[PDB]
Amino acid sequence: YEYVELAKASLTSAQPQHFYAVVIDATFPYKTNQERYICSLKIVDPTLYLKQQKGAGDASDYATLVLYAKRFEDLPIIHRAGDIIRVHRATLRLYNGQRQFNANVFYSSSWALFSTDKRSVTQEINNQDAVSDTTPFSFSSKHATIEKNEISILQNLRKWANQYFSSYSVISSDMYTALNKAQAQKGDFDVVAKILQVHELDEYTNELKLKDASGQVFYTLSLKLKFPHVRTGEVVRIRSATYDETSTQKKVLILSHYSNIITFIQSSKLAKELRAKIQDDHSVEVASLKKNVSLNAVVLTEVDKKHAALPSTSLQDLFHHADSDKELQAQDTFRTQFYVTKIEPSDVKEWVKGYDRKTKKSSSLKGASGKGDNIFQVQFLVKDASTQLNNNTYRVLLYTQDGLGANFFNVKADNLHKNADARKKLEDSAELLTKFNSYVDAVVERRNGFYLIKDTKLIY
């Protein structure tokens, strides 16, 4: 096998050619008819990656790759831009002025993907390790072979990819539309924004809260199975999106079966600048707290910074598998998300009780301070996406006698029968928590079969 550079590939031979290249864009593998699937991507290399700079504006130049197949599983799923793909037996031709490489995988063509970063997206999601730097994390056909002479190619192109992504935007301004101008587009368009929030809408759907450099916020649904790599705080490029005119309560983007959500390799200059430039926005949330019925979800809390790198656990596992699953048994501290259906005790004034540390008993303060230290003894009845359909509600406690969850309400424990200020603040919070579309993101600690909230605080 001989590998040719993108710009040097023959346009006349019309013979099968092979090459290595960096993927900067790609559609998701999609079906076109009762037998064909396609995946169109944009590729670059040391000989083709930027337009004639002078009046080009530093726009990116690229070649296009079109893979054909009879089965979905025979096409590459590009989750991250910047990775490398090796193709075998591709025919080159000019399509509307650009170098178009066509490869029929259902016949004799094949592809192989190599992680430019230490790990592939899937490997990062599973906290795995790479077999080797010359091992493809995915490929077409039952076999993929790498020769000794390829190592230098792959290793060099990798070095080039990082230099390329760290020096240029790669995804230039001409390759996407600003969110505050999305409504002006006739058809579909591309986006480049930071994921401000990943809200689990249902058993199979994530609702991404996006915000781009224009300051505009948008929401879009992202199937869990299709895009399992979405993460809050990360920057992604969305291939093919449309403005939803039928949504008046919130700005929504519509995606198609061919639409794709792509992240950037660690060295991405664009992603790096956007992660810092674009900052969290709570304007939508703050505005919803004034509505009787908000169609926009509101995460009322924030977990301690130290628990940020902690994966979440659903109520289904927390309450139905925490005593049977080998793994869940080993953990005592968990993070989870849910919405409050009811709060006990009903009387907010009873949320704070007097606690005697010698008898391990608490009591009402409707009869003066002769009971002991003031503590919160609140019992939340919650539910979530994983348990959304069952006839259950789960108990989550906020017992602050030992310090856990003492600052949840941003209101130090006090006699609510006398301190009107504290009572009102807690009464208002009680309304926000039980209101539709209000959710809680918190860290809990398993103690004697119960979960107590800790390192979690309201931000409204």
Binding site: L201, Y339, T341, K360, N390, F436, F450, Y451
Partner: protein, 216 residues
């Protein structure tokens, strides 16, 4: 102002506890819609979303009569006009019916629909499942949440708070997490079903029986 007639109709129905009478009257006018599919699933659009109409045994017998030279299962890419229709909420298994969500579905009962054969309709956006729309899924979640909150506040009583001694001072204490599980309602099975709206009931026809009725 809502542009999707189907979305506004279905949303208002859900926001009005399935009470079709309480839904706006200025919306109960004829519905001209493009047919996206006719078999195995009959789906129509309003220029934004697609939904599945449910024909009564009377509806099809009428159609067949007024239009003998026409087959319903072949109305694909054709536009129809529903003059007499209604909306009703029905409990379903969303795992089987894809035109539903959270085991609930708003049905478009078609009593009388005329086929405006060969009428080219203005080019619009690609039709999407209304029951997959963000706002509509949210509207339905609001519905269930309201029913759940009412049922729970009625079922759960007495402030049965976990005794504080069970959590504090429990170094030698061990417990099972299923102790925190509380029944949300007096429901029978394992699925919440304590709703208040009255499930509509109108004998309808499967799109398969009509297929055999036109080409057995």
């Amino acid at each position: 102002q809502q542009q999707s007639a189907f979305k506004q109709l279905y949303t208002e129905l859900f926001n009005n506890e399935g009470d079709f009478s309480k839904v706006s009257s200025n919306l109960k006018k004829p519905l001209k819609c493009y047919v996206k599919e006719s078999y195995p699933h009959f789906l129509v659009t309003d220029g934004y979303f697609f939904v599945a109409p449910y024909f009564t045994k009377e509806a099809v017998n009428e159609f067949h009569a007024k239009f003998p030279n026409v087959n319903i299962v072949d109305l694909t890419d054709k536009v129809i006009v529903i003059n007499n229709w209604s909306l009703e909420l029905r409990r379903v298994n969303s795992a089987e019916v894809f035109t539903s969500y959270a085991n609930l579905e708003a049905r478009l009962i078609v009593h009388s629909f005329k086929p405006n054969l060969q009428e080219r309709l203005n080019p619009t956006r690609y039709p999407v499942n209304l029951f997959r729309d963000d706002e509509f899924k949210t509207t339905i979640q609001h519905f269930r949440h309201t029913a759940l909150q009412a049922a729970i506040n009625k079922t759960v009583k007495g402030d049965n708070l976990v005794d504080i001694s069970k959590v504090a001072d429990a170094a030698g204490k061990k417990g099972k997490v299923d102790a925190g599980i509380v029944k949300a309602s007096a429901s029978k099975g394992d699925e919440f079903s304590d709703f208040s709206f009255k499930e509509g009931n109108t004998a309808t026809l499967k799109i398969a029986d009509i297929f055999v009725q036109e080409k057995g």
